[PDB]
Amino acid sequence: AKSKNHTAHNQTRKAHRNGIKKPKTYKYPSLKGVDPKFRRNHKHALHGTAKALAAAKK
Amino acid sequence: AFQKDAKSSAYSSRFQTPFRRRREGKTDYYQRKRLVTQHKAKYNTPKYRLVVRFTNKDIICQIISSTITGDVVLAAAYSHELPRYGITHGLTNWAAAYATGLLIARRTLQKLGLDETYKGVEEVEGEYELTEAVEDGPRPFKVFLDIGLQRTTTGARVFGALKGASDGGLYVPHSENRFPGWDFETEEIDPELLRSYIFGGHVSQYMEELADDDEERFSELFKGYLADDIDADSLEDIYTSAHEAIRADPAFKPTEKKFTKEQYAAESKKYRQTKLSKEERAARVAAKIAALAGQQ
Amino acid sequence: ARRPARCYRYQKNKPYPKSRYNRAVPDSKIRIYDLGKKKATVDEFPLCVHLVSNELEQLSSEALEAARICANKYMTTVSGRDAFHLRVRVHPFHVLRINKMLQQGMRGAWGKPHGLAARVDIGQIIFSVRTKDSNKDVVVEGLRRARYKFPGQQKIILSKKWGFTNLDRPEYLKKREAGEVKDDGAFVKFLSKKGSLENNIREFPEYFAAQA
Amino acid sequence: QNPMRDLKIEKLVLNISVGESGDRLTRASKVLEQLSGQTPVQSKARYTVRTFGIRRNEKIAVHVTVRGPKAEEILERGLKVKEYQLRDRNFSATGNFGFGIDEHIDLGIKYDPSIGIFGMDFYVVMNRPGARVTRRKRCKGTVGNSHKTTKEDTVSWFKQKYDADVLDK
Amino acid sequence: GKSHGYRSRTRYMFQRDFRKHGAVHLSTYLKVYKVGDIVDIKANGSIQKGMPHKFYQGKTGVVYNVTKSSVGVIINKMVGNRYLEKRLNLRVEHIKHSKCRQEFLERVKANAAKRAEAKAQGVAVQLKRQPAQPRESRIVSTEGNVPQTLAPVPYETFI
RNA sequence: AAGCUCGUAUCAGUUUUAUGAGGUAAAGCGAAUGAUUAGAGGUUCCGGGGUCGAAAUGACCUUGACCUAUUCUCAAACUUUAAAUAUGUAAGAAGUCCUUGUUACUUAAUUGAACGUGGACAUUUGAAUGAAGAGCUUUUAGUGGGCCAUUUUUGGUAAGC
RNA sequence: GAGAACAGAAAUCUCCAGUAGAACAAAAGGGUAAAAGCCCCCUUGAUUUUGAUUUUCAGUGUGAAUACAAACCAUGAAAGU
RNA sequence: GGUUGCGGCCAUAUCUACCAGAAAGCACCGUUUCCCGUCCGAUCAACUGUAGUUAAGCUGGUAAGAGCCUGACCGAGUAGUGUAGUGGGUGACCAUACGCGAAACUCAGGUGCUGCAAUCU
Ligand SMILES: CN[C@@H]1[C@@H](O)[C@@H](O[C@@H]2[C@@H](O)[C@H](O[C@H]3O[C@H](CN)CC[C@H]3N)[C@@H](N)C[C@H]2N)OC[C@]1(C)O
Ligand SMILES: CN[C@@H]1[C@@H](O)[C@@H](O[C@@H]2[C@@H](O)[C@H](O[C@H]3O[C@H](CN)CC[C@H]3N)[C@@H](N)C[C@H]2N)OC[C@]1(C)O
Ligand SMILES: CN[C@@H]1[C@@H](O)[C@@H](O[C@@H]2[C@@H](O)[C@H](O[C@H]3O[C@H](CN)CC[C@H]3N)[C@@H](N)C[C@H]2N)OC[C@]1(C)O
Ligand SMILES: [Mg+2]
Ligand SMILES: [Mg+2]
Ligand SMILES: [Mg+2]
Ligand SMILES: [Mg+2]
Ligand SMILES: [Mg+2]
Ligand SMILES: [Mg+2]
Ligand SMILES: [Mg+2]
Ligand SMILES: [Mg+2]
Ligand SMILES: [Mg+2]
Ligand SMILES: [Mg+2]
Ligand SMILES: [Mg+2]
Ligand SMILES: [Mg+2]
Ligand SMILES: [Mg+2]
Ligand SMILES: [Mg+2]
Ligand SMILES: [Mg+2]
Ligand SMILES: [Mg+2]
Ligand SMILES: [Mg+2]
Ligand SMILES: [Mg+2]
Ligand SMILES: [Mg+2]
Ligand SMILES: [Mg+2]
Ligand SMILES: [Mg+2]
Ligand SMILES: [Mg+2]
Ligand SMILES: [Mg+2]
Ligand SMILES: [Mg+2]
Ligand SMILES: [Mg+2]
Ligand SMILES: [Mg+2]
Numbered sequence A: 001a002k003s004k005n006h007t008a009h010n011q012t013r014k015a016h017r018n019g020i021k022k023p024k025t026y027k028y029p030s031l032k033g034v035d036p037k038f039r040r041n042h043k044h045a046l047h048g049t050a051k052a053l054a055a056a057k058k
Numbered sequence B: 001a002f003q004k005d006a007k008s009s010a011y012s013s014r015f016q017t018p019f020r021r022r023r024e025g026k027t028d029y030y031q032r033k034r035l036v037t038q039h040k041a042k043y044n045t046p047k048y049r050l051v052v053r054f055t056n057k058d059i060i061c062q063i064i065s066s067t068i069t070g071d072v073v074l075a076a077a078y079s080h081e082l083p084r085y086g087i088t089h090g091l092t093n094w095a096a097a098y099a100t101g102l103l104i105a106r107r108t109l110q111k112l113g114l115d116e117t118y119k120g121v122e123e124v125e126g127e128y129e130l131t132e133a134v135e136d137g138p139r140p141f142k143v144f145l146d147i148g149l150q151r152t153t154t155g156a157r158v159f160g161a162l163k164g165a166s167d168g169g170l171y172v173p174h175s176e177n178r179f180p181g182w183d184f185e186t187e188e189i190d191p192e193l194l195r196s197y198i199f200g201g202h203v204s205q206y207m208e209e210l211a212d213d214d215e216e217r218f219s220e221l222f223k224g225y226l227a228d229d230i231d232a233d234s235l236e237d238i239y240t241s242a243h244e245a246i247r248a249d250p251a252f253k254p255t256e257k258k259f260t261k262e263q264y265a266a267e268s269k270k271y272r273q274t275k276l277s278k279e280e281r282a283a284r285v286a287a288k289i290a291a292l293a294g295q296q
Numbered sequence C: 001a002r003r004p005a006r007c008y009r010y011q012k013n014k015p016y017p018k019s020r021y022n023r024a025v026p027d028s029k030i031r032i033y034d035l036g037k038k039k040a041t042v043d044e045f046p047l048c049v050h051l052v053s054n055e056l057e058q059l060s061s062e063a064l065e066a067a068r069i070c071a072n073k074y075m076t077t078v079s080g081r082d083a084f085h086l087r088v089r090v091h092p093f094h095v096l097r098i099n100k101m102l103q104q105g106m107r108g109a110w111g112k113p114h115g116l117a118a119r120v121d122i123g124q125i126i127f128s129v130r131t132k133d134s135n136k137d138v139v140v141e142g143l144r145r146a147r148y149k150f151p152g153q154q155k156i157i158l159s160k161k162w163g164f165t166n167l168d169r170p171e172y173l174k175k176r177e178a179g180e181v182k183d184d185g186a187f188v189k190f191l192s193k194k195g196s197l198e199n200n201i202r203e204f205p206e207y208f209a210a211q212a
Numbered sequence D: 001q002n003p004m005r006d007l008k009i010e011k012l013v014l015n016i017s018v019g020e021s022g023d024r025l026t027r028a029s030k031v032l033e034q035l036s037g038q039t040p041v042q043s044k045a046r047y048t049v050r051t052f053g054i055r056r057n058e059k060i061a062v063h064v065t066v067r068g069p070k071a072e073e074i075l076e077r078g079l080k081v082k083e084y085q086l087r088d089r090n091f092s093a094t095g096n097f098g099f100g101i102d103e104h105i106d107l108g109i110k111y112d113p114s115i116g117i118f119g120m121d122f123y124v125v126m127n128r129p130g131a132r133v134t135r136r137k138r139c140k141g142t143v144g145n146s147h148k149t150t151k152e153d154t155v156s157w158f159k160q161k162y163d164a165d166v167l168d169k
Numbered sequence E: 001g002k003s004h005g006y007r008s009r010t011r012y013m014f015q016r017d018f019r020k021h022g023a024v025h026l027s028t029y030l031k032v033y034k035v036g037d038i039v040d041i042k043a044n045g046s047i048q049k050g051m052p053h054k055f056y057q058g059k060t061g062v063v064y065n066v067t068k069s070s071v072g073v074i075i076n077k078m079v080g081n082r083y084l085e086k087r088l089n090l091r092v093e094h095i096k097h098s099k100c101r102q103e104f105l106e107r108v109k110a111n112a113a114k115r116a117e118a119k120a121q122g123v124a125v126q127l128k129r130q131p132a133q134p135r136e137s138r139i140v141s142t143e144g145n146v147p148q149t150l151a152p153v154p155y156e157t158f159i
Numbered sequence F: 001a002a003g004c005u006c007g008u009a010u011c012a013g014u015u016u017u018a019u020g021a022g023g024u025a026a027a028g029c030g031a032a033u034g035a036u037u038a039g040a041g042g043u044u045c046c047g048g049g050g051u052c053g054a055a056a057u058g059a060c061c062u063u064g065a066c067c068u069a070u071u072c073u074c075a076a077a078c079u080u081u082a083a084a085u086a087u088g089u090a091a092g093a094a095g096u097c098c099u100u101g102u103u104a105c106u107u108a109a110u111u112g113a114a115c116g117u118g119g120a121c122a123u124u125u126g127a128a129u130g131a132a133g134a135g136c137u138u139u140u141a142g143u144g145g146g147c148c149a150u151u152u153u154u155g156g157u158a159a160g161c
Numbered sequence G: 001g002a003g004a005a006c007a008g009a010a011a012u013c014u015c016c017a018g019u020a021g022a023a024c025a026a027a028a029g030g031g032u033a034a035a036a037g038c039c040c041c042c043u044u045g046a047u048u049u050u051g052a053u054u055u056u057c058a059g060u061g062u063g064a065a066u067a068c069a070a071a072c073c074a075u076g077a078a079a080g081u
Numbered sequence H: 001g002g003u004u005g006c007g008g009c010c011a012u013a014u015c016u017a018c019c020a021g022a023a024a025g026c027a028c029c030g031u032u033u034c035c036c037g038u039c040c041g042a043u044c045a046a047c048u049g050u051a052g053u054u055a056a057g058c059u060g061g062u063a064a065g066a067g068c069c070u071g072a073c074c075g076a077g078u079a080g081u082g083u084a085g086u087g088g089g090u091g092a093c094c095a096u097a098c099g100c101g102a103a104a105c106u107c108a109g110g111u112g113c114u115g116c117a118a119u120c121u
């Protein structure tokens, strides 16, 4: 055998066809990984303020 | 210094100077880090250390927080304030530590608003406890003991500041085993030895064992307890009422001054040498170059 | 047993000297880099003529030796073995390798050290010589003779300076008859205008006249 | 002037360097016990030299450091056996000194064959007052030149008190 | 064999600094980071815990989380033809607030004060950033400044 | 190939502006490590010799080692310094600011932290240039021997290697 | 480097200088000085339960690590780790 | 202004040698009964602020000092380098065109700035 071992040749050519797409941002990122203490409370700090905007809306 | 001494250009060039306050041996940073730094989830919640520093015969108790701009002092109570509370001698002693740490405890608790709440142990029998949690009401003021460079030894007198600051009502977490009366040989505290110490009963027990076995020394030391005639057995009630005075009025009367910064400025600026100009330097050198040449 | 000097002439590979990871390398064929009267004082020999490389190439030690020997061997037997000072101005720290020895599994070619060579720049000095201006032509032809031992082009140039110092003849004679130059071995030392004034004057007592 | 620069004797260190361990060692540190009155401290061999009969950590020598008037006592009692004659050597250029004596008995120890005889290294360390700057924990620092313990300066103190002799140049 | 370990190739990169070694000063710990703070990553070699990977060295990111010793930092890593979001767990000693932000804030705030002062004065606000423009006309005075005539210089040696 | 949701809303193998990271090129060795030519000057409970001797903790010449201040030359696996090209993030409505709900997390402390209600500001709403728009999904082909030029570059004396 | 009986180039004792020129099982490179090195004392977090992450990467597995949550602990006056 | 306690930045602060330091505060210093630690109250603990001293620590000043820091009509638009040509040269290598642009070095200026709280002729 003895056939070529490796190269990056052409590889940016293929990469750029469909073009290195930007990360695609949103508002409201997911909390994945955020500390469980913060989150567990933050659940009630939200559930809590939803009742407060139900009663107050009447 | 010496000849085969005298560091080179290299050694200087490549030298790395420690911090000023490690170069002055005043600050152990490996401890300061672990004390001051705050849980990153508690954000700008300050970490509050109780700094206890003995000079030679004076005591400092400072509740301090920290900024990148430098640390900030809540309030301080030095031992040398103790005369206004009726202690005129032995201000460097364990029972004065206790006295000063209790003055610093009320003073801060005063200025904060927790003064009427959290009165600490008022009876002061020297039993081992720490100030508890008021139910339905603010948590006690939590402050941490900064021992400085003090060796931690059971019965050492930094922990007097502790006991008095705890008994003042501040929250200062701690254990017993550094309190005089902690038995090496058993898990026990004997708070009777600790109450005696709180009131100076180890110093008062000294005068007695002195007065009859040496009056030559007893002339030397306790000399102030003679000229003012406060004798050995009278000591415990000096302190016992000093706490009364303490919780009465923590408020920190500042010194009356007598003169002013401008005055103290001028009188001190009398004594400091002003820096020479470069023109002045070019003079002396050109003066030395005239001197040493021409057959000296 | 040596490969012709062609094979190693150009500077192809990264400088690879005797090293903690080399260790195996031979002895340089050149050893002694200063010849003639080498304690001679800075004012004894004003004149300086360099040998200058016109190429970016590699001189072998064994060439450096043969040119050193050659030039000196002449320069002494014309103007005398104290007449000059010959300073080889380049050193051979670059280790040349050789791969000594169809076939099969499996080649690997790394060389064992075959020799040493001095990497030279264009306009980098091979030889410096100092003598008295009286002795010029003898030195020049002496360098012109060692020239033939070196691959590729090199040139000889009368130095604008005073011997091996960093000063031109007039600017040197300035600091000389002013009190600023003191003898050290073959070289000199110079009066600092900065530093401790104390031993500044301990040295250079010749100074602190402010006259001839 | 010179009010607070004395020359105190910081400590005196008796040293018995005995090339083995076991019995003969304990007898050599039983010696130093009754001279100092303190219970003394033993030294382990750094490495194995095998021509000195020493193995690494074999507990070779013994010593004790003594401070206060208990020093001047033993210094004098040892300065006796020197016939109050020391040398220009015996003095470090850092301001201290020391000597040595064969026969520990040559200062009032009796003999007691159940113990035996040992020579001693006597070393006397000097400093002025205020040298705890270099010792204490907080704010440690080295003491300035004027106050440092020098050699020429300690000899001048060593001849003055004790009346004794420097002797070699 | 070839080698690629977690710190492979970090020799000089994680090297401490010159004369800057030894335990870190306190303000590094004194800083406060909350979520959505934009931080630089540079690893400090002396702190091995919570240390970033060599790749993210020099990469700026947004903190998504605040835990005891650490900010979680969220960084978009291109792999192949796309970017992937990666969530780093970094100790404060390697994190640095980024100044890339502040000049934009010190502009925004400037624009509000520029705008309100302008508008309540009147119209004519110019708050978009124009890039460097060509030079405007000018007359350079000859007066006591007379053109100096220079010439190319000959060949010399002075070796 | 199929389209699908939308339509100037975003979009960019580019510049600029602000702010990061980097340790190559160069440079350096009278800076650290390492290597290296040459002299000059100091030194001793003391490396070898020699001379005066009945011995020097002698006295001298000697040659080494050392030490200081100089000198020629160096590095892929050395370095204080440190480029060019390349490289991260930012340049607004998901912005900025005011008022003040929720919470079981946090603080001594409605202190914080996170999420909001309500409220002020939209002509240049916050650089340049461009845009046959932008976003999005499924599904499947061939391929998975490569070779060449210039520049960086490893092994090799070299090679159409 | 200057000192101390036997003691010698090397035993043990002392003071001075010493930015790390040492040590940290091993390869090398990083890192470390009131330590991360040396001595000491107390211990078993080399434990429990399940998720998130980083490297390699297909962003699979494996190895390795990082930062949390919920336990139960160890050390320390204490912050803490 | 001085000093202390806690600091931030961590040499313009460190290094060598000298000189000066009122006041206060530091300090060095006295003691060994008590908790406590050592072979050694040296260090560490404790009592006295009494008995003594600015000697040193500390702070300031001095020096064509060393080091460090800063700047640039320094080195130098040099080296290096992105880009171009069917430019030069047997080559090695080099000029030119449109851009970016060092380093040691040379000279010069400088030798801690400052946060909180207390205290002080
Ligand atoms: C203007 N900035 C500086 C300029 O002040 C000066 O810097 C030197 C600096 O090179 C010297 O030091 C330098 O050179 C030494 C080797 N000779 C090794 C240490 C290195 N920092 C410093 N000791 C004094 C500065 N004035 O020269 C270099 C520079 C970068 O231009
Ligand atoms: C301008 N470069 C010159 C180039 O012109 C050439 O020079 C030739 C030289 O080789 C020829 O000469 C040589 O080659 C001949 C075959 N062409 C045979 C004779 C031989 N002397 C001369 N007759 C003419 C020169 N201009 O080769 C030498 C060189 C330096 O490369
Ligand atoms: C590569 N050969 C050398 C290269 O090594 C280096 O040479 C320096 C030389 O420039 C220095 O010389 C210079 O530096 C002095 C120190 N700051 C002051 C001024 C000058 N004499 C010498 N002190 C040391 C040589 N190795 O720079 C000059 C050179 C010829 O290129
Ligand atoms: Mg092939
Ligand atoms: Mg293949
Ligand atoms: Mg293979
Ligand atoms: Mg500690
Ligand atoms: Mg316990
Ligand atoms: Mg080449
Ligand atoms: Mg090249
Ligand atoms: Mg090659
Ligand atoms: Mg090259
Ligand atoms: Mg010949
Ligand atoms: Mg074969
Ligand atoms: Mg073969
Ligand atoms: Mg030739
Ligand atoms: Mg030719
Ligand atoms: Mg020290
Ligand atoms: Mg490898
Ligand atoms: Mg770096
Ligand atoms: Mg390093
Ligand atoms: Mg350090
Ligand atoms: Mg550290
Ligand atoms: Mg670990
Ligand atoms: Mg504008
Ligand atoms: Mg660009
Ligand atoms: Mg290089
Ligand atoms: Mg350089
Ligand atoms: Mg070097």
Ligand SMILES: [Mg+2]
Binding pocket: none
């Ligand atoms: Mg290199």
Ligand SMILES: [Mg+2]
Binding pocket: none
């Ligand atoms: Mg950029």
Ligand SMILES: [Mg+2]
Binding pocket: none
């Ligand atoms: Mg735009």
Ligand SMILES: [Mg+2]
Binding pocket: none
């Ligand atoms: Mg499209």
Ligand SMILES: [Mg+2]
Binding pocket: F140
């Ligand atoms: Mg397909």
Ligand SMILES: [Mg+2]
Binding pocket: none
């Ligand atoms: Mg297929």
Ligand SMILES: [Mg+2]
Binding pocket: none
């Ligand atoms: Mg396939």
Ligand SMILES: [Mg+2]
Binding pocket: F145, F146
């Ligand atoms: Mg093929």
Ligand SMILES: [Mg+2]
Binding pocket: none
């Ligand atoms: Mg061809």
Ligand SMILES: [Mg+2]
Binding pocket: none
């Ligand atoms: Mg020391």
Ligand SMILES: [Mg+2]
Binding pocket: none
């Ligand atoms: Mg180091």
Ligand SMILES: [Mg+2]
Binding pocket: G033
């Ligand atoms: Mg140390």
Ligand SMILES: [Mg+2]
Binding pocket: G033
């Ligand atoms: Mg240290």
Ligand SMILES: [Mg+2]
Binding pocket: none
């Ligand atoms: Mg997991």
Ligand SMILES: [Mg+2]
Binding pocket: none
């Ligand atoms: Mg994995």
Ligand SMILES: [Mg+2]
Binding pocket: none
């Ligand atoms: Mg005074």
